[PDB]
Design a protein around this ligand. Structure first.
Ligand SMILES: OC[C@H]1O[C@H](OC[C@H]2O[C@@H](O)[C@H](O)[C@@H](O)[C@@H]2O)[C@H](O)[C@@H](O)[C@@H]1O
Ligand SMILES: OC[C@H]1O[C@H](OC[C@H]2O[C@@H](O)[C@H](O)[C@@H](O)[C@@H]2O)[C@H](O)[C@@H](O)[C@@H]1O
Lengths: 142, 142
């Protein structure tokens, strides 16, 4: 389907939620948030993706960890906007839906910022990950 | 029935290519480009819309005019995203197709910027217009 550019750096390993997204529309957003966003895990219908980020609790060498943040989406709710700040890594993620605007994950928003609009709702993410979210790409439904 | 939010300001007169787009898929982008994009005019199959912008030559009293730019789409090529900078008006537009990123219309890109995904390809545009492009809304095929 249509996809944004890749937002972030070259580190970590690639991931692509495409196949998992065939289970259904996103029903839930889970992140771990401190001064930056250290992982992202979407639920597609009733099936969670893997935890994309914070590979290991020993990641506490190079960044704060943060607290788990879960936003359950209501039926018919979908993600229409993602504001991402990023350089070598994704720094912060602010999601808006057709129903509400969620709090930013990542209190520091000092890196270069991009706003991606997804009419009809986000279908899934891909990117790269390890101890953090090295980068994100946003995929539309068609 | 999927469409982006309206990007731009309240001036001009509303336009909507919904009807003229029954003539077929977009085959050409014609714009007028200086430091801003002053008009847009898509061709739907063989039929052009009216010129949405640069109402008349007295508009030179308020902004530069620019040069006509035409991008011909090949069969099976469709517009999949637009980077739009905008405020009171549309400032610049960089269209991307499933085959290529095209040159930007409007050399100045200093106003708020959004990357609009257009799922399934652009079906048609709506917006508002006068001496320039007050605003745009992208109607997706999805
Ligand atoms: O996802 C971020 C990062 O995770 C892993 O690297 C973690 C740190 O390892 C150190 O050697 C380096 O000095 C730090 O900058 C790294 O954050 C992973 O090995 C790497 O590929 C990822 O980019
Ligand atoms: O399409 C933009 C603009 O076109 C016409 O306005 C042109 C200018 O008129 C002046 O009075 C005004 O001070 C300027 O800001 C305008 O650019 C149209 O009348 C207007 O509705 C449109 O916004």
């Amino acid at each position: 389907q249509v996809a944004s550019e890749y937002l972030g750096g070259p580190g970590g390993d690639a991931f692509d939620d495409k196949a998992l997204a065939q289970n259904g529309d996103i029903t839930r957003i889970e992140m771990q948030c401190t001064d930056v966003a250290t992982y992202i895990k979407l639920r597609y219908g009733k099936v969670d993706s893997r935890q994309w980020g914070w590979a290991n609790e020993n990641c506490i060498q190079w960044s704060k960890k943060g607290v788990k943040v879960v936003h359950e989406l209501s039926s018919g709710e979908y993600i229409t906007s993602a504001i991402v700040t990023y350089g070598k890594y994704v720094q912060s993620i602010t999601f808006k839906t057709n129903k509400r605007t969620l709090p930013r994950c990542g209190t520091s928003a000092t890196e270069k910022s991009v706003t991606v609009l997804i009419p009809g709702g986000l279908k899934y993410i891909s990117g790269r990950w390890g101890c953090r979210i090295d980068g994100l790409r946003f995929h539309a439904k068609c």
